Amino acid sequence: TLFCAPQEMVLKNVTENFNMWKNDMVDQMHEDVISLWDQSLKPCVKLTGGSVIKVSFDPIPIHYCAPAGYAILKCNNKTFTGTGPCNNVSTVQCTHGIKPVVSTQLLLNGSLAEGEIIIRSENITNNVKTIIVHLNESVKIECTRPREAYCNINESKWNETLQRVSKKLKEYFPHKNITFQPSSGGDLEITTHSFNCGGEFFYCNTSSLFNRTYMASTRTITIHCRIKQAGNITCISIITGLLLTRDGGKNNTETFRPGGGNMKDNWRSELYKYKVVEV
Amino acid sequence: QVQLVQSGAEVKKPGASVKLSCKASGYGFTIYSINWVRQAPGQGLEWMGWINPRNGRIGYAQKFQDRVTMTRDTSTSIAYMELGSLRYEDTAVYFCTRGQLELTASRFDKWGQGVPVTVSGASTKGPSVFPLAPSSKSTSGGTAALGCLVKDYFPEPVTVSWNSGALTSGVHTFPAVLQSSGLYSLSSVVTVPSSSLGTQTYICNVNHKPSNTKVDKRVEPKS
Amino acid sequence: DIVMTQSPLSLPVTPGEPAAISCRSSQSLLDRADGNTYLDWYLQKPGQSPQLLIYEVSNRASGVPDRFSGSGSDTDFTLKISRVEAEDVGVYYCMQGLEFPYSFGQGTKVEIKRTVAAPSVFIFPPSDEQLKSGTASVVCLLNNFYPREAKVQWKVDNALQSGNSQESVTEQDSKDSTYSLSSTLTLSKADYEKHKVYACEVTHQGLSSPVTKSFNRGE
Ligand SMILES: *[C@@H]1O[C@H](CO)[C@@H](O)[C@H](O)[C@H]1NC(C)=O
Ligand SMILES: *[C@@H]1O[C@H](CO)[C@@H](O)[C@H](O)[C@H]1NC(C)=O
Ligand SMILES: *[C@@H]1O[C@H](CO)[C@@H](O)[C@H](O)[C@H]1NC(C)=O
Ligand SMILES: *[C@@H]1O[C@H](CO)[C@@H](O)[C@H](O)[C@H]1NC(C)=O
Ligand SMILES: *[C@@H]1O[C@H](CO)[C@@H](O)[C@H](O)[C@H]1NC(C)=O
Ligand SMILES: *[C@@H]1O[C@H](CO)[C@@H](O)[C@H](O)[C@H]1NC(C)=O
Ligand SMILES: *[C@@H]1O[C@H](CO)[C@@H](O)[C@H](O)[C@H]1NC(C)=O
Ligand SMILES: *[C@@H]1O[C@H](CO)[C@@H](O)[C@H](O)[C@H]1NC(C)=O
Ligand SMILES: *[C@@H]1O[C@H](CO)[C@@H](O)[C@H](O)[C@H]1NC(C)=O
């Protein structure tokens, strides 16, 4: 176990291996957020028998700390891909604050890349594995209500973001055209950009956002959402990354689609720089 | 315990669609993937695509991309695969298989029994069972051969037995062959001693369930 | 597509002795983002669906006997059997599970090695009932032989035919470990009566000279 709730020390001349897809911490966070989700049950007190009885789901930066006998190592290389040996590594008592945001397609309120846009993956050949993209410059998205709702994005900032992401994806597939298409199918949770905002689940259609084909100012995009749990409701989130899934490689093109659904991908995007070891 | 049951056999005309089922049981359906793999007659294996039964995510093989739809019904642990615009080159046995999730969809540890899917413009025709007469000489002693020629039938299968199952050894029902006319044809033969001719009556039992044809031909020599 | 190349396509093995099958992929199967190598070995026994033998290069699937073993790295892989039992006969396919489409090897038919056994050849003329239908079919049976390689040439009035016959072979017999072939020459009734002699000439390793079994139409 790893206890969930400020000191750090660098380890001079130490090299320890990290594996993005084999991380006991990502397994831990997945179980802990599942446990907190399951608390949509009535609390209980006791007088004679089991007598059955704050909707503040709003995320707060939580931390994962090392219990006695265990330590947490952190990779200080800010371009670290997730898998392989890290040269610059330190012992930290607790991980940085992590807002446990459960969104699909777009990663909201996370940490930005240090430098350029980063594909957080040693290799993206495996089509089954989700591609975690980390953006260096954030993109605002205002979602509002008066059932149904809508979201707005700057447009010139969005189609610019996808252009810089397509150039950086083309580094992995040189001499290949990079295309984006909407989600190919499945449940509404994954086919749309879904997320929780003050007791409300949104399901925003992203077909207009992901329909670009890249060869080798005050305008906005408005996307419609379905709502399922005040008259007016609003969220002003910040897109910090994307979750993509690659189709089967065709002739001279590579198609990417917004992915999600696996809640472990959301925790991989933040915990890719940590590892639990024994003291 | 862990089973993957599949829907018998289907015959569809060219241009049509098929929807095959795959009933999962004995394990956590949403914690394992379902892949579909096909096999043309006498040919190898070809993967068609995968599905994540938890959230419905799919990934199809590029050659089947815009003509296949994989879906599931978690309320019954059934997994579907719909192949549209059928071509004659789609005539094959279609298997469903349990795979992994997250790291890969591979490691096909459990498999269904398959579903033959014939794609043709032929109509359900019964076989014409002609005899294969034992040679009037046939060494005039020792082993001799005789059989039946189950010809011009559609679709598969045809079941042949000898003397209502009494004659088992020395029998060989050959695999069928698809003729130019689009109709199947197979032979069944058995080697019995020459001593037994006349003394033992031989009958082949042909049963084509699709057309409800039941034929029992007596095979015998002539002069 | 990651082409998977198996070597050898045919493999007769004397039971009890060991066997090995190689698989070579055009690309590395090591998932560098994971550390795992996604290669499996499947066995398809006669008249049955496939089944998992080894997963991720060397791990045996549940129930798989210790006889079966996997090894290799990156692009070369080998499935090995220590004692080849009767149950092991089938087609073995290697398979990559890294990139779409997931691709298989062509298959390796493992069978029992047996002493050479020549075929007993039989020729059956078309029945009179079939000759009413206006189509004649002449069958040639090669009964119980080993190895499987055998050429059946159909001749009509000594003239060697081509493109008007169809063949089919049985799977290796469970007891004698031999095969049987059926070749059917199909002619129209009008062509069948324009010729008298009908023969099928079989060529096989066990036959010192190619055998011919013929009949004259009526005669
Ligand atoms: C940081 O990680 C990535 C891994 O792809 C790469 O830039 C390099 O290996 C590392 N850089 C440094 C400064 O160690
Ligand atoms: C490595 O980590 C140390 C921690 O003290 C930091 O000062 C340094 O900038 C990091 N990067 C390099 C390139 O050494
Ligand atoms: C942000 O990322 C883009 C795309 O990788 C890059 O062109 C740009 O220089 C980066 N911005 C800064 C401030 O470095
Ligand atoms: C939208 O993005 C552009 C850069 O792409 C930026 O200059 C502009 O200020 C943004 N729009 C608004 C309304 O601020
Ligand atoms: C800008 O974004 C819109 C959003 O749909 C897209 O249609 C357009 O192609 C993008 N690029 C330019 C240059 O307008
Ligand atoms: C998304 O919107 C498009 C039209 O813009 C529509 O064709 C599609 O059905 C919608 N998908 C969902 C999941 O609502
Ligand atoms: C993508 O845009 C093109 C037009 O530019 C259109 O043909 C296509 O249907 C759009 N939507 C999807 C789901 O591909
Ligand atoms: C993202 O952050 C804003 C505040 O910065 C918050 O109001 C919003 O609810 C968060 N988004 C989600 C999906 O919780
Ligand atoms: C990714 O892994 C594949 C494995 O087949 C390898 O061939 C390829 O070189 C790797 N990609 C990069 C950019 O190293």
C-alpha dihedral over B103, B106, B107, B108, to 10 degrees?
Answer: 140
Neighbours of A4 (CB within 10 A): 17
For chain A, first and last CA: distance in Å?
A: 14
DSSP symbol at A197: -
Ligand nearest to the CA of A138: 3
CB of A157 closer than 6 A to ligand 4?
Answer: yes
Closest partner CB to A19 (pick from C35, C38, C101): C35
DSSP symbol at A163: H
Does A48 reside within a domain?
no
Question: Nearest-5° angle of CA C200, CA C202, CA C205?
Answer: 180
Q: How far apart are CA A166 and CA A180, in angstroms?
A: 9
Ligand 6 pocket test: pick from A150, A207, A257 the residue with the most ligand atoms within 8 Å of its Cβ.
A207
- Tell me how far the alpha carbon of residue B151 is from its chain's centroid: 17
**C96: exposed, middle or buried (C-beta count within 10 Å: 0-12, 13-18, 19+)?**
buried
CB A241 within 8 A of CB A111: no
Q: How far apart are CA A95 and CA A71, in angstroms?
A: 11
The type of residue at A224 is H
- Across C74-217, the runs of DSSP E, i.e. the strands, are 76-81, 90-96, 108-112, 120-124, 135-145, 151-156, 159-160, 165-169, 179-188, 197-203, 211-216
Cβ contact (<8 Å) for B57 and A261? yes
Backbone angles phi, psi at A266, to 5 degrees: -65, -40
Q: Coil, strand, or helix at residue A158?
A: helix
Please name the residues between 160 and 199 in chain C that touch chain B, using a CB distance below 8 Å. 166-170, 180, 182, 184, 186
The helix or strand, by DSSP H or E, that contains position C153, with its residue range, turns out to be strand C151-156
Q: How far apart are CA C79 and CA C82, in angstroms?
A: 10
Compute CA distances A125 → A30, A121, C186, whole Å.
25, 10, 52
A26: CB partners within 8 A, 6+ apart: A264, A267, A268, A271
Q: How far apart are CA C131 and CA C190, in angstroms?
A: 10
Q: How far apart are CA B97 and CA A59, in angstroms?
A: 40
Does A122 reside within a domain?
yes
CB C8 within 8 A of CB C20: no
- Across A154-209, the runs of DSSP E, i.e. the strands, are 177-180, 193-196, 201-204
Q: Give the distance (Å) from ligand 7 centre to CA of residue B87.
A: 27
**C194: exposed, middle or buried (C-beta count within 10 Å: 0-12, 13-18, 19+)?**
exposed
According to DSSP, the residues that pair with A238 across neighbouring strands are A140
Q: Which residue bears the tokens 């100012």?
A: A217
Does A51 reside within a domain?
no
Largest CA distance in chain B: 73
Backbone angles phi, psi at A112, to 5 degrees: -85, 155
Q: Closest Cα of chain B to C157: distance in Å?
A: 20
Backbone angles phi, psi at A221, to 5 degrees: -105, 135
Ligand nearest to the CA of A78: 1
For chain B, which residues make up each domain, given as ranges?
A: 3-119, 128-219
Compute CA distances A148 → A107, A143, A199, A227, whole Å.
22, 11, 15, 5
Closest partner CB to B56 (pick from A127, A185, A262): A185
CB C219 within 8 A of CB C196: yes
According to DSSP, the residues that pair with B178 across neighbouring strands are B184
CB B53 within 8 A of CB B74: yes
C-alpha dihedral over A225, A228, A233, A236, to 10 degrees?
Answer: -50
Q: Closest Cα of chain B to C40: distance in Å?
A: 7
Q: Coil, strand, or helix at residue A271?
A: helix
DSSP symbol at C28: -
Task: Give the range of the structural domain holding residue A85, as residue numbers without chain letter.
Answer: 3-41+56-278
Q: How far apart are CA B55 and CA B96, in angstroms?
A: 18
Three-state SS for B126-181 is CCEEEEECCCCCHHHCCEEEEEEEEEEEECCCCEEEEHHHCECCCEEECCCEECCC
Nearest CA to ligand 7 atom 4: A211
The helix or strand, by DSSP H or E, that contains position A270, with its residue range, turns out to be helix A263-271
CB of A15 closer than 6 A to ligand 1?
Answer: no
Q: Coil, strand, or helix at residue A263?
A: helix
Does A37 reside within a domain?
yes
CB C184 within 8 A of CB C136: no
Neighbours of B169 (CB within 10 A): 9
Q: Give the distance (Å) from ligand 7 centre to CA of residue B66.
A: 14
Q: Answer yes or no: CATH 2.60.40.10 is held by domain B3-119.
A: yes
C201: CB partners within 8 A, 6+ apart: C152, C153, C155, C210, C211, C212
Q: How far apart are CA A116 and CA A126, in angstroms?
A: 23
Q: How far apart are CA C66 and CA C44, in angstroms?
A: 18
Q: Counting atoms of ligand 3 from 1, which one is nearest the CA of A136?
A: 1
Does A176 reside within a domain?
yes
Q: Give the distance (Å) from ligand 5 centre to CA of residue A221.
A: 9
Q: After which residues is chain B broken (C to N over 2.5 A)?
A: none
- Tell me how far the alpha carbon of residue C208 is from its chain's centroid: 24
Q: Coil, strand, or helix at residue A83?
A: coil
Q: For chain C, list the domains and their CATH numbers.
A: 4-112 (2.60.40.10), 120-216 (2.60.40.10)
Which residues in B lie closer than 8 A to residue C141 (C-beta atoms)? 145, 147, 187, 189
Q: Closest Cα of chain A to C124: distance in Å?
A: 53
Does A21 reside within a domain?
yes
Q: Which residue bears the tokens 């037995």?
A: B161
The sign of the dihedral angle between the CA atoms of B40, B44, B45, B46 is negative
| Beta-strand pair B110-111/B92-99 | antiparallel
B178: CB partners within 8 A, 6+ apart: B184
Largest CA distance in chain A: 74
CB A22 within 8 A of CB C34: yes
Q: How far apart are CA A174 and CA A167, in angstroms?
A: 10
C182: CB partners within 8 A, 6+ apart: B174, B187, B189, C139, C140, C141, C167, C168, C169
B60, two tokens: 């199809």
B94: CB partners within 8 A, 6+ apart: B20, B36, B37, B38, B48, B81, B114, B115, B117
> Each residue of A177-198: b (16+ CB within 10 Å) or e?
bbbbebbbbbbebbbbbbbbbe
The type of residue at A174 is P
What domain count does chain A have? 1
| CATH value at residue A221 | 2.170.40.20
Sheet holding A274-278, edge to edge: A8-10, A89-92, A70-75, A274-278
- Tell me how far the alpha carbon of residue A84 is from its chain's centroid: 21
The type of residue at B80 is Y
DSSP symbol at A191: H
Closest partner CB to A261 (pick from B55, B59, B103): B55
Backbone angles phi, psi at A159, to 5 degrees: -60, -20
A237: CB partners within 8 A, 6+ apart: A108, A109, A140, A141, A143, A195, A197
Q: What is the Cα Rg of chain B in Å?
A: 23
Q: Considering only CA atoms, which of B39, B21, B19 is closest in space to residue B92?
A: B39
Nearest CA to ligand 8 atom 12: A197
Class of domain B128-219: mainly beta
Backbone angles phi, psi at C51, to 5 degrees: -155, 150
B71, two tokens: 């879906």
Closest partner CB to A126 (pick from B58, B61, B104): B104
Compute CA distances A268 → A9, A15, A60, B50, B137, whole Å.
23, 21, 18, 23, 81
Does A49 reside within a domain?
no
